[PDB]
Amino acid sequence: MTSITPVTLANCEDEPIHVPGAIQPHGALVTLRADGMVLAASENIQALLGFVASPGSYLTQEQVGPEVLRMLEEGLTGNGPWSNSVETRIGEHLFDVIGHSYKEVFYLEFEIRTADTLSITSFTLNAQRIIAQVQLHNDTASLLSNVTDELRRMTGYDRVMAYRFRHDDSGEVVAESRREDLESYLGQRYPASDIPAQARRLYIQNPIRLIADVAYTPMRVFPALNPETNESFDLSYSVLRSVSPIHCEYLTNMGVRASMSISIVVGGKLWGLFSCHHMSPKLIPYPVRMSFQIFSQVCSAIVERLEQGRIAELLRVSTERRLALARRARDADDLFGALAHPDDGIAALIPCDGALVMLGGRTLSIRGDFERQAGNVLQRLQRDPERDIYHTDNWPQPSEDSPDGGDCCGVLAIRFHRQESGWIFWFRHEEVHRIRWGGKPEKLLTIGPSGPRLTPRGSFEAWEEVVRGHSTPWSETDLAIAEKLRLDLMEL
Amino acid sequence: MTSITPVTLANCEDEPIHVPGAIQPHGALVTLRADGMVLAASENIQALLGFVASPGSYLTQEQVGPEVLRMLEEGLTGNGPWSNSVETRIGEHLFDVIGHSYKEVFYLEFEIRTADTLSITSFTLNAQRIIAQVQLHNDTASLLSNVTDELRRMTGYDRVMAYRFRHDDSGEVVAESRREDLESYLGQRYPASDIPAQARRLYIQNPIRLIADVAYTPMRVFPALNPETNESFDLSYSVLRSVSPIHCEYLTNMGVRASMSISIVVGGKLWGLFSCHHMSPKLIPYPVRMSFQIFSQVCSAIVERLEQGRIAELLRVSTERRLALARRARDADDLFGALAHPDDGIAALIPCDGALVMLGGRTLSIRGDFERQAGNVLQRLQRDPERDIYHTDNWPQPSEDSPDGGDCCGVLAIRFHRQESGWIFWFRHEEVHRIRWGGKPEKLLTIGPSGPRLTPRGSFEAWEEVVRGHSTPWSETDLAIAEKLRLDLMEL
Ligand SMILES: C=CC1=C(C)/C(=C\C2=[NH+]C(=C\c3[nH]c(/C=C4\NC(=O)[C@@H](C)\C4=C/C)c(C)c3CCC(=O)O)/C(CCC(=O)O)=C2C)NC1=O
Ligand SMILES: C=CC1=C(C)/C(=C\C2=[NH+]C(=C\c3[nH]c(/C=C4\NC(=O)[C@@H](C)\C4=C/C)c(C)c3CCC(=O)O)/C(CCC(=O)O)=C2C)NC1=O
Fold first, then answer.
1. Quick one: where's region Chromophore binding domain (chains A, B)?
2. Which helix (H) or strand (E) element contains residue B206?
3. Which chain A residues have any C-beta within 8 angstroms of a chain B C-beta?
């Protein structure tokens, strides 16, 4: 046999999950050349479809029937990306046949329709009403909160969570709906490393991902290498694509047996994800998944609009505050009274855990005590004094050699008056300190061979270790506001 | 009984089509008060549902079943607009019960499902494929044409057209798909009076309008007036709402027996409309219509994005063209040689049928002879020598008493040099004359008692009458470009 790489926690960061060479046993995959010649098929193809797709053969009406052949021929003879489906009866079972093409290869996926058509119609209507009602939401928090409960009410999943991804791709459960006896994961954080770059790519490219059974045994696709090119078949868009063994073990530790997740894509990146988890196997009919795929596209457009609105509104309000303060600084009797004003001062321009004003030897801390942090920052800046703007989200925490210390892990500053040490500072506390007061998801469970990290506790500890000593970073909005404020203060 | 106004061409522009007091016989309508008390019901309620909804009574589980009552209870107890539907078997038929509330009145519409779950699932999948595929179009013309052909392929309508409404609400068939034996209406124009303000409002508020059989006899609603307010029930959102007698006459003259239309709303105004016509009665199942309602919302958002992109691109191109012209005029030895350039002159900045350059007593016409027309415009402007910018879209056509005259219906004039009579003019020919180059959509048909205006040719003649002597008006973008050109030439 060829070489094989064992998937372990040390190498899973680069696991080739897009080319597993196997599919979930709830369906069968047929791979076809651009001329319709069968390149490879699944080992269970004879079990599900009752016919053998011998490589090098061509499909016939005796095998897949006329509807599948007409769909396929319309695909092979078409131009550009192809994606279609048809219903057909093969043997006794009714199969949903999904067709698509990728990297010049054509795929046919035979999925048994186990649910009744009446339920499929009702479930489609409910999904379509989500698609319609989601346009009425005024804010993304309301949207995610309402959609999570409506998605659970419709699908009946034991748990539904909405994830929102932060600047570093770390996940956060921002909304939840769950069975009464289930442990709540609301507010849990987990590191970006829990969803490898390849998985994030797949979540961005494919709007819906479904795992019918985590305890499944993959069915192989033979040959594993493409007969024409010595490379594995790229199953990136396959609906039946196998699951990584590590994610299976992770979900297994949580007792999750099935999952379905709906991606939210904004600006070409995975902005959020509705993830539905079930404690027992659960299949969602293909027409309903297609309705959720349209929901994903619509909700992504709505969330993009709502985020653009929220950003524009924050820029408007910030500009109004900035102009009001820039005027008052000249109009007021004292620049400290203006800048340090509890509501109209600089502390209201950038969301911060405190601020400090320094000018002509004068100092004043806002919402805290930051005099020594500013002093140490200046002592560091003295090694590179031409920095009129300074930005850090990872100020080094000092050793126990001093009782006073840099508890403000983040510092942002502006030198508005070089002549008299005119400095403006914004401070933020550790991103762990900003959350630890809310508790932690730490629990103990029966755990598989890979150990405790494949559990929500281990995931949260790994996040805590990643953001340890780091404050929430200054976004491009904050940096823009800071530079604009300096440009305004350059006149004063 | 109260008097009833006869709907005729003299008063049809004021017809209150939103309160017809009747519905189409393919379904039944029940009106309810906010407490669930029956206010009024359609005279066919017994024929379809098997029970009588006597005003003042309450619906019981024996009449409509628990599903309808649970949905209604949720609607009556919910806060804000309500809209939901459920599938239920009432008497001998399976119904799609659509519930909604308007002006504090609750309505229940029972529609018999004529198709099985199969076929409906396939039709819904096809509609969903359109919804997904329409996001791949990069231009509005390609979108409208492809959607028109795919909508015809799915629905099987004898004809499908895409109307695009203009600044004066006039319509134009910009795309068509039709049966081999059907007469083509591509490029037909019709006046705004063909769709009164109330019909436009309803097409904006309700994304789907269906007419199952134009030859139908409306089923009246009794009582005719709301017992709580003594006013007619507002059916603006009802899907069974009756059709005006005059549009039934119009479609009867066209030989059309059924119609379905999908609205395209951009900026809160009816931007366009896909209309499907059938030569025989045709019903579209409710789940499929809800799929097309989501298609209408998605298509409206896509068309809005595409039109915004096209407008921004036109502003970019116009800016570059204006700057290029200014540079060439600065580098050219003779300003006339640059301004009269066929590809980079004033004729390239604004869509026009002709232009004229005048300066220091020099005159030069572009794309034809406009010297005497410009002379007459100056004669009109000489009455107000302070007018530096003038535009008109209804230039009075001179009589036959002169061999030459103002043969231009549109005139846009700008003065860039008061001392040197520096003037720029753009001219546009009659809109009818502009269309006549593409053919004449006129034919004769059998006509009804309202006479020839309720025919496609009658609508074309009425449009010709409405735009006679008028050119396409100068839009805000054209005026902005013209003003910027004026300022740039003043700088030069
Ligand atoms: C309380 C719950 C909880 C969860 C579910 C969580 C993380 C999380 N993993 C996700 C997916 C994947 N993760 C890995 C691989 C790795 N898994 C690891 O743990 C490290 C060692 C590792 C690589 C270095 C792969 C291949 C996939 C793709 C699976 C596929 O679809 O084939 C997702 C996506 C959405 C979802 O599944 O709900 C989430 C949200 N964190 C928590 O606290
Ligand atoms: C060759 C084809 C062709 C067409 C189809 C055309 C006109 C046209 N009428 C439309 C609708 C309506 N018109 C009127 C009323 C008036 N109709 C008139 O003729 C004058 C007298 C009048 C009032 C003063 C009303 C109440 C409705 C609403 C009907 C309802 O209840 O749903 C539409 C919408 C789309 C559609 O119907 O497919 C179009 C496109 N003009 C053409 O050349």
1. 17-492
2. none
3. 83-87, 117-118, 120-122, 124-125, 128-129, 131-132, 135, 287, 290-291, 293-294, 297-298, 301
